[PDB]
């Protein structure tokens with residue numbers, strides 16, 4: 001619930017927030033949930 | 045040499061650079077732990093990062 005709430009609130013700020021790693025073998029993200037979900041209220 | 049003729053022996057196993065960070069220890073966890081190592085030595089004073 002906390003991850004879905006933070007992602008839903010982050011989607012309003014920017015569309016292509018979900019980005020993942022290309023390959024484990026062989027553009028660093030700047031807008032993640034590390035600095036965004038400071039407050040959260042799931043199910044009261 | 046200076047410890048005489050005790051039954052223990054000393055074997056060495058060394059690996060080199062990997063640019064990716066997970067594949068540094070990905071080789072280590074099945075090479076050295078499978079080799080029953082006692083100590084691992086990291087000796088890289090140049091890094092690209």
Ligand SMILES: *[C@@H]1O[C@H](CO)[C@@H](O[C@@H]2O[C@H](CO)[C@@H](O)[C@H](O)[C@H]2NC(C)=O)[C@H](O)[C@H]1NC(C)=O
Pocket residue numbers: 055056057079
């Ligand atoms: C040190 O112990 C191992 C025992 O096999 C040998 O070295 C490695 O052996 C593994 C298989 O367990 C191989 O995958 C590696 O390629 C081997 N490395 C080397 C450098 O051969 C080896 O017999 C022993 N002594 C030496 C020479 O490292």
Ligand SMILES: *[C@@H]1O[C@H](CO)[C@@H](O)[C@H](O)[C@H]1NC(C)=O
Pocket residue numbers: 039040041
């Ligand atoms: C969290 O903080 C923001 C800051 O603007 C505030 O508007 C909001 O009411 C707070 N509550 C949640 C959990 O969204």
